[PDB]
Design a protein around this motif. Structure first.
Motif, PDB file in Angstrom:
ATOM      1  N   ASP A   9      24.963  23.892 110.703  1.00 56.02           N
ATOM      2  CA  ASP A   9      25.619  22.629 110.352  1.00 56.02           C
ATOM      3  C   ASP A   9      26.843  22.350 111.246  1.00 56.02           C
ATOM      4  O   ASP A   9      27.357  23.236 111.949  1.00 56.02           O
ATOM      5  N   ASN A  10      27.338  21.098 111.189  1.00 56.05           N
ATOM      6  CA  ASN A  10      28.389  20.668 112.120  1.00 56.05           C
ATOM      7  C   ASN A  10      29.538  21.681 112.142  1.00 56.05           C
ATOM      8  O   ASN A  10      30.063  22.051 113.207  1.00 56.05           O
ATOM      9  N   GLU A  70      27.262  28.957  98.560  1.00 55.69           N
ATOM     10  CA  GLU A  70      26.402  28.626  99.691  1.00 55.69           C
ATOM     11  C   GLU A  70      27.002  27.543 100.580  1.00 55.69           C
ATOM     12  O   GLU A  70      26.578  27.397 101.733  1.00 55.69           O
ATOM     13  N   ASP A 119      11.493  33.056 106.708  1.00 57.18           N
ATOM     14  CA  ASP A 119      12.790  32.399 106.608  1.00 57.18           C
ATOM     15  C   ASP A 119      12.804  31.305 105.549  1.00 57.18           C
ATOM     16  O   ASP A 119      13.883  30.945 105.063  1.00 57.18           O
ATOM     17  N   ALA A 162      18.256  24.495 100.627  1.00 57.86           N
ATOM     18  CA  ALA A 162      19.577  24.399 101.235  1.00 57.86           C
ATOM     19  C   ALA A 162      19.541  23.323 102.306  1.00 57.86           C
ATOM     20  O   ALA A 162      18.779  23.434 103.271  1.00 57.86           O
ATOM     21  N   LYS A 163      20.363  22.286 102.135  1.00 63.40           N
ATOM     22  CA  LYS A 163      20.435  21.195 103.095  1.00 63.40           C
ATOM     23  C   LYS A 163      21.711  21.327 103.910  1.00 63.40           C
ATOM     24  O   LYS A 163      22.804  21.347 103.321  1.00 63.40           O
ATOM     25  N   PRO A 164      21.642  21.434 105.238  1.00 61.35           N
ATOM     26  CA  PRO A 164      22.876  21.529 106.025  1.00 61.35           C
ATOM     27  C   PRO A 164      23.786  20.334 105.783  1.00 61.35           C
ATOM     28  O   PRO A 164      23.336  19.186 105.730  1.00 61.35           O
ATOM     29  N   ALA A 165      25.077  20.615 105.636  1.00 66.14           N
ATOM     30  CA  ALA A 165      26.048  19.557 105.399  1.00 66.14           C
ATOM     31  C   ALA A 165      26.102  18.607 106.590  1.00 66.14           C
ATOM     32  O   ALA A 165      25.909  19.003 107.743  1.00 66.14           O
ATOM     33  N   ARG A 166      26.367  17.336 106.299  1.00 64.79           N
ATOM     34  CA  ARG A 166      26.447  16.322 107.344  1.00 64.79           C
ATOM     35  C   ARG A 166      27.645  16.603 108.244  1.00 64.79           C
ATOM     36  O   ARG A 166      28.794  16.565 107.791  1.00 64.79           O
ATOM     37  N   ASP A 167      27.376  16.882 109.515  1.00 64.53           N
ATOM     38  CA  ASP A 167      28.411  17.189 110.489  1.00 64.53           C
ATOM     39  C   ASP A 167      28.707  15.966 111.349  1.00 64.53           C
ATOM     40  O   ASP A 167      27.832  15.136 111.605  1.00 64.53           O
ATOM     41  N   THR A 168      29.959  15.865 111.794  1.00 69.24           N
ATOM     42  CA  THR A 168      30.375  14.745 112.629  1.00 69.24           C
ATOM     43  C   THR A 168      30.016  14.941 114.095  1.00 69.24           C
ATOM     44  O   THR A 168      29.910  13.953 114.830  1.00 69.24           O
ATOM     45  N   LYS A 169      29.831  16.187 114.537  1.00 72.54           N
ATOM     46  CA  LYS A 169      29.470  16.429 115.931  1.00 72.54           C
ATOM     47  C   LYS A 169      28.155  15.747 116.284  1.00 72.54           C
ATOM     48  O   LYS A 169      28.029  15.139 117.354  1.00 72.54           O
ATOM     49  N   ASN A 222      21.964  16.670 107.521  1.00 72.48           N
ATOM     50  CA  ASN A 222      22.410  16.716 108.906  1.00 72.48           C
ATOM     51  C   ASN A 222      21.533  15.825 109.780  1.00 72.48           C
ATOM     52  O   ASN A 222      20.345  15.627 109.515  1.00 72.48           O
ATOM     53  N   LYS A 242      20.568  16.378 112.904  1.00 76.28           N
ATOM     54  CA  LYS A 242      19.549  17.158 113.601  1.00 76.28           C
ATOM     55  C   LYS A 242      18.370  17.457 112.683  1.00 76.28           C
ATOM     56  O   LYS A 242      17.210  17.240 113.052  1.00 76.28           O
ATOM     57  N   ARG A 278      22.066  32.304  93.863  1.00 76.29           N
ATOM     58  CA  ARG A 278      21.506  31.265  94.720  1.00 76.29           C
ATOM     59  C   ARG A 278      20.644  30.300  93.917  1.00 76.29           C
ATOM     60  O   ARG A 278      20.665  29.087  94.161  1.00 76.29           O
ATOM     61  N   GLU A 321      22.966  27.975  91.899  1.00 78.36           N
ATOM     62  CA  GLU A 321      23.499  26.953  92.791  1.00 78.36           C
ATOM     63  C   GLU A 321      22.402  26.019  93.285  1.00 78.36           C
ATOM     64  O   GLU A 321      22.661  24.837  93.536  1.00 78.36           O
ATOM     65  N   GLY A 340      22.372  21.794  92.725  1.00 80.50           N
ATOM     66  CA  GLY A 340      22.208  20.731  93.702  1.00 80.50           C
ATOM     67  C   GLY A 340      21.211  19.677  93.266  1.00 80.50           C
ATOM     68  O   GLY A 340      21.385  18.491  93.564  1.00 80.50           O
ATOM     69  N   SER A 355      23.152  17.391  90.746  1.00 80.82           N
ATOM     70  CA  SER A 355      24.105  16.515  91.419  1.00 80.82           C
ATOM     71  C   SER A 355      23.389  15.478  92.272  1.00 80.82           C
ATOM     72  O   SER A 355      23.826  14.323  92.358  1.00 80.82           O
TER      73      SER A 355
END
Lengths: 621, 255
Positions: free
Chosen positions: A4-5, A302, B40, B47-54, B93, B95, B181, B184, B188, B191
């Motif tokens: 992630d970012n 997480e 994997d 699990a979803k990768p958090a939104r990144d600004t890059k 994210n 990507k 896990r 959590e 998600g 939410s």
């Protein structure tokens, strides 16, 4: 990409920190390298690293064991002061944003003196006068409120100024406070400390002015059980209230060990995570020197894995993290031969978990984190970093990228691991060794050839060639794809003068000649193919050579004896064709020779072969 | 086919598990080959990768060429708009969100459903969690079946301990337990479902009604699968008092 970012930005920072140590440069501040990314996120994370820096910014004894620094009363004392200085400054920022709407807004007009700020803080948080206050006011505010919130912000001077304008009202408290401000470690002399405590306990145990109560036992570190909940309603106000009450060497006394253990044992995560706010508990553990607990705890969220791994690295590159000797233990544990009040982190497992996530499609970044394991080994002796690179190559199969591609021209373009160690001979054999154990000979050869291990390259190349020696070499076949790599290994092994033991080596160049013998035989170039087999002196053609050639067959590699059947037949069929086109006697004599040789040699399919050989000789006559 | 994407891999894997469950062992050798390729996937439930600004600033700055793994793709003004839309609705994210949309163009499901390209990304994303979690229930369900061979019954048992619960087998052997896990993970889903109704109700207060219904169905099915997996894990005596207290508190805080 699986990062992630936030995680990606950290990876880049950890690449720098590695590039610096890989080129021998100055060991930069890791904590600073991590806070550099924190500012790109919400302040929830920035204020964490601020705490990490201030809690780790203690004078240490370089080149000293981790357990020793953390057990020493010397260091344990400075932790309490660094935390109190964080709780005081942190609260001071709360007091600013409470008066001004934004930190920027406060700054443009100028941060006012801690005294005038506190005064402009009392206006809001108590607009009307509470009827239980004592000792009057000072410039429009109760004298004890000013003293408390000034001490809470950490400006003892601002608090003492308040005392100087109420000398008559406060009685003997002046000479006591003036001593507290002077004496270091926020402690009074036992004699004077006794005088005030007994006075407070005498008739002020229950006073209608809560601020008065708070100040007295903050100065005297008394009434540890009373949490002064009237004034310390927030969690940070509690931590700060107690760290100003801890003591060091029996009644009404609390020590850091008791307090740190008392907090998480009795009031565990459950108590501090009911509001579903994770950092609150982390700050409780980190500001009490329980770094391993806070790291494991925060490592389970997480969403905050990234942050907990790095705060572990910082504690690891500062000889402050207490690693677990055994790698078979749980993530968090207390060694059996250690005091119960300290805990240990299985750092090896910690990184191993974090890595598995992005090790599959982001190898480069994984290695940067594996490097921190360079200083550790396992039960079998392997270097943990080296082993992690082996497992990562076996799984990812990223040979050119991680190990360096050895082209077929003789070049070795270095790989990503070359940066970290120049001795890349073992792992290339480790990776080559397993792939060899998995029947992946064509790969094990390329890998062994990458490490210039010709003993194994030629060995495997002997196995891959023998089955294909008599086969038909056709475009894109398995013969061409193996012959052409064998020749690309013959040149590079002659131009560089490399060779395995003569047994492995002799067989390797012998097969290459035979592969040429059948490639000429299958093409119809009979004359040319006959000449090659004659040079090899493998099959006798004159009766005199039968004795010696027969003895040689006994000690020639079985990869050669296997193909003896097809060689005799091709050679016979060669003479056979040339006959239909003195010379007749010469072919006839040679025909005989092949038979007697084959008769004395026990080999593959000697039955069908010896029969066919005899028939072809009869047709000649 | 042989080069199946993530979605096609989970869909095909699900069919194999049903065969073994319905007394059809014609895919034993093919079943073991799939668990190794998706190792994997079973490790992390959801699990979803958090939104990144890059990636947000870089995606829109040069929306010309995109490089994902080993393959390369070309981004146009139309496709780039779907990436930002999918990432915003699901908070995924850029990507990872792009890869989901790319899988739709290759498979060409836009014509099979006749829906916008950005909407297909939402369905494709939910399908992954469905099979990824539903397939786990079949493993434990088959591992407890008494009407099958004892040998096969034990194979799926030890496999689930390592693939699902992350517990290595007895012949070998920092990491987080499975329950924390899973707790959590289910959090998600709640939410995400809560924010869905708030945002959906705001705009509603279209052609996506059926898609929203299907997404809600997939979410409730995934929650049921996670609950069943948690029950199965607890049936193996792999819990403690902290998890019990947390569950009791969550129940007390039920609205």
């Amino acid at each position: 990409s699986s990062l992630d970012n936030i995680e990606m930005a950290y990876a880049r920072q950890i690449y720098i920190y590695n590039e610096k140590i890989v080129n021998g440069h100055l060991q930069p501040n890791l904590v600073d390298l991590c806070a550099s990314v924190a500012e790109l996120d919400d302040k929830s994370i920035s204020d964490m690293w601020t705490m990490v820096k201030q809690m780790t910014d203690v004078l240490l004894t370089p080149a000293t064991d981790a357990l020793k620094n953390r057990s020493s009363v010397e260091v344990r004392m400075e932790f309490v002061r660094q935390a109190l200085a964080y709780l005081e400054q942190s609260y001071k920022n709360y007091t600013l944003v409470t008066v001004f709407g934004n930190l920027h807004q406060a700054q443009l007009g100028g941060v006012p003196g801690t005294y005038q700020l506190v005064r402009s803080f009392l206006n809001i948080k108590l607009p009307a006068p509470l009827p239980g206050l004592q000792d009057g006011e000072v410039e429009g505010h109760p004298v004890w409120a000013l003293i408390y919130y000034c001490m809470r912000c950490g400006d003892l001077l601002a608090a003492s100024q308040v005392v100087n304008r109420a000398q008559h009202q406060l009685g003997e408290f002046k000479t006591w406070f003036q001593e507290y401000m002077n004496s270091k470690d926020r402690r009074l002399s036992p004699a004077t400390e006794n005088k005030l405590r007994l006075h407070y306990r005498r008739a002020l145990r229950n006073n209608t002015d809560p601020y008065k109560r708070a100040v007295y036992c903050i100065i005297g570190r008394c009434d540890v059980t009373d949490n002064q909940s009237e004034v310390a309603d927030k969690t940070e106000d509690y931590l700060w209230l107690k760290l100003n009450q801890v003591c060091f060497d029996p009644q009404d006394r609390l020590t850091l060990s008791q307090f740190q253990k008392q907090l998480l044992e009795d009031y565990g995560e459950s108590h501090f995570t009911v509001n579903q706010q994770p950092f609150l508990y982390f700050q409780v553990l980190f500001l009490t020197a329980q770094f391993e607990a806070a790291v494991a705890f925060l490592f389970r969220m997480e969403r905050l894995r990234c942050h907990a791994v790095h705060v572990a690295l910082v504690l690891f590159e500062l000889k402050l993290l207490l690693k677990s000797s055994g790698q078979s233990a749980q993530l968090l544990s207390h060694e059996p031969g250690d005091p119960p009040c300290l805990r240990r982190l299985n750092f090896v497992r910690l990184l191993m978990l974090y890595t598995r996530k992005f090790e599959s499609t982001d190898p480069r970044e994984a290695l940067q984190y594996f490097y921190f394991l360079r200083d550790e080994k396992d039960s079998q002796g392997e270097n943990m970093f080296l082993r992690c690179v082996s497992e990562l190559v076996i799984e990812s199969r990223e040979f050119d990228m991680i190990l360096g591609k050895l082209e077929n021209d003789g070049s070795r373009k270095p790989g990503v691991i070359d940066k970290f160690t120049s001795d890349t001979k073992p792992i290339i054999n480790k990776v080559a060794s397993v792939a060899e154990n998995k029947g992946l000979f064509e790969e094990a050869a390329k890998l062994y050839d990458l490490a210039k291990n010709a003993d194994k390259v030629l060995e495997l190349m002997n196995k891959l060639l023998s089955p294909v020696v008599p086969q038909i070499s056709a475009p894109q076949s398995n013969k061409e794809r193996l012959k052409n790599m064998a020749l690309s290994i013959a040149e590079r092994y002659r131009a560089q003068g490399i060779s395995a033991n003569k047994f492995v080596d002799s067989t390797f160049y012998l097969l290459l000649d035979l592969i040429t013998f059948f490639d000429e035989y299958h093409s119809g170039h009979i004359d040319r193919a006959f000449d090659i087999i004659e040079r090899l002196k493998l099959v006798p053609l004159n009766q005199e050579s039968v004795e010696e050639r027969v003895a040689a067959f006994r000690n020639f590699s079985d990869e050669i004896r296997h193909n003896l059947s097809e060689v005799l037949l091709a050679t016979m069929n060669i003479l056979f064709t040339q006959f239909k086109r003195d010379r007749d006697s010469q072919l006839r004599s040679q025909a005989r020779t092949l038979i007697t040789f084959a008769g004395m040699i026990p080999y593959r399919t000697s039955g069908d072969t010896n029969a066919r050989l005899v028939q072809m000789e009869v047709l000649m006559n | 086919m042989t080069d199946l994407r993530k979605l096609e891999a989970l869909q095909a894997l699900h069919a194999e598990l049903v065969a073994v469950r319905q007394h059809r062992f014609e895919g034993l050798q093919v079943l073991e080959t799939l668990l190794e390729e998706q190792t994997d996937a079973f490790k992390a439930l959801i699990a979803k990768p958090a939104r990144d600004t890059k990636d947000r600033e870089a995606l829109g700055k040069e929306p010309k060429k995109l490089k994902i793994g080993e393959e390369e793709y070309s981004l146009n003004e139309d496709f780039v708009n779907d990436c930002l839309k999918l990432a915003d609705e699901l908070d995924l994210n850029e990507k990872e969100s792009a890869r989901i949309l790319i899988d739709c163009d290759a498979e060409g499901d836009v014509e099979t459903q006749s829906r916008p390209l950005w909407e297909c990304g939402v369905i494709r994303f939910h399908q992954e969690r469905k099979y990824l979690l539903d397939c786990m229930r079949l493993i434990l369900e088959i591992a407890a079946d008494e009407d099958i061979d004892a040998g096969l019954q034990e194979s799926f048992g030890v496999a689930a301990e390592d693939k699902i619960f992350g517990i290595p087998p007895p012949w070998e052997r920092q990491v987080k337990k499975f329950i924390p896990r899973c707790m959590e993970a289910m959090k998600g889903v709640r939410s995400m479902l809560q924010c869905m109704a708030d945002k959906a109700n705001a705009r509603n207060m279209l052609d996506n009604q059926e898609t929203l219904d299907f997404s809600r169905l997939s979410l409730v099915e995934q929650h049921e699968c996670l609950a069943s997996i948690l029950h199965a894990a607890v049936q193996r005596h792999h819990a403690t008092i902290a998890d019990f207290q947390d569950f009791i508190k969550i129940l007390r805080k039920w609205d």
